[PDB]
Design a protein around this ligand. Structure first.
Ligand SMILES: O=C(O)Cc1nc2ccccc2s1
Ligand SMILES: [Zn+2]
Ligand SMILES: [Zn+2]
Ligand SMILES: [Zn+2]
Length: 101
């Protein structure tokens, strides 16, 4: 199981009314692969196995929680764990609808 809570959920911000684009490329390198969306500022950056731009974004912003456009899991960089909680349901559901129809 993911953690059912973490102390950084307070930093999850409202979903833009434009919604989410799960095909959006990395804002730095432009890769289509292994992207995440930041649940604070909604910038999109690639995962550790591509060029690590989301980890970089965490480092330079301190934003805690990011959502995978592969599997809709949410990672907290501070807790170094996956987290699931009702505060993430709306954003996960919006991503699921955009990804899968
Ligand atoms: O790729 C990323 O930037 C986010 C993630 N970092 C890790 C590190 C270890 C285990 C799972 C994850 S998910
Ligand atoms: Zn990148
Ligand atoms: Zn951010
Ligand atoms: Zn956390």
């Amino acid at each position: 199981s993911p953690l059912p809570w973490c102390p950084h959920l307070v930093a999850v911000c409202p979903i833009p009314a434009a919604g989410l684009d799960v095909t959006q490329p990395c804002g730095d390198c432009g890769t289509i692969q292994e992207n995440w969306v930041c649940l604070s500022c909604y910038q999109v950056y690639c995962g550790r196995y591509i060029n690590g731009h989301m980890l970089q974004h965490h480092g330079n912003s301190g934003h805690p929680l990011v959502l995978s456009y592969i599997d809709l899991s949410a990672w907290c960089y501070y807790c170094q764990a996956y987290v699931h909680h009702q505060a993430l349901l709306d954003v996960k559901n919006i991503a699921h609808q955009n990804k899968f129809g």
